[PDB]
Design a protein around this ligand. Sequence first.
Ligand SMILES: CCC(O)(CC)c1ccc2cc(-c3[nH]nc4cc(-c5ccccc5)sc34)[nH]c2c1
Length: 243
Amino acid sequence: GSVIDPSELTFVQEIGSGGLVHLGYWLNKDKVAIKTIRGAMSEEDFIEEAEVMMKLSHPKLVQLYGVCLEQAPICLVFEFMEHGCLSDYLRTQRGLFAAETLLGMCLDVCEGMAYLEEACVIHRDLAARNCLVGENQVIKVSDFGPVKWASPEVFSFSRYSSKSDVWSFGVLMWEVFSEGKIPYERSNSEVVEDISTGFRLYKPRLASTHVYQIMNHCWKERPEDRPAFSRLLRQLAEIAESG
Ligand SMILES: CCC(O)(CC)c1ccc2cc(-c3[nH]nc4cc(-c5ccccc5)sc34)[nH]c2c1
């Protein structure tokens, strides 16, 4: 449920585009991020994803205040994340990040994805662009309600599972350690044929041998050979404890 009246919301500034993302206030008190509809995408599916997001509670997942239904275009009322999009945050603060900080960001994404794995929810589009940065560099997973991030089962047979999101997490891990670099920067059919041949993303300078090894385990051809998010969480924690 959670229905918000349009008069309660106050639009301040446009902060994102795709629909549009606006910085605003709810009841003239709380800082909120308002996601308005474009056109493309169904109005019911946009609300169906919001109902799923409001039922999943984890400190590493973005929380929703409510939904505006009365006036069209309809909108989602999200909590405001101070530093915004992860991919953009990595590019702006490039060269200022330490290896420990970048690994800490990957552990935050893996925490939220381990919760979704147990709750049997497939993300379908896990990327650095769909991750948000809050206060004290805390990373939260969004849009949990593009073949570069897709696994061989997805771009050829459209088989979605928890192991296909593991492949996406491997590509996400590459974006973090490369400090916001575009993966396979190359057309869709060019990369889809490159992956099957045996070509993967190169080793980033900031990432270590143990970090890149975990990325390749996520990049395994067979879904069964890839480790689960629950296992990956403990493997990433072992690197942070030692080096
Ligand atoms: C310096 C970062 C800043 O420029 C500050 C205004 C910025 C830019 C963009 C965003 C977006 C957010 C944000 N907070 N919470 C959400 C949820 C979002 C969302 C978008 C699409 C689908 C689902 C959720 S975007 C967002 N905070 C920002 C902060």
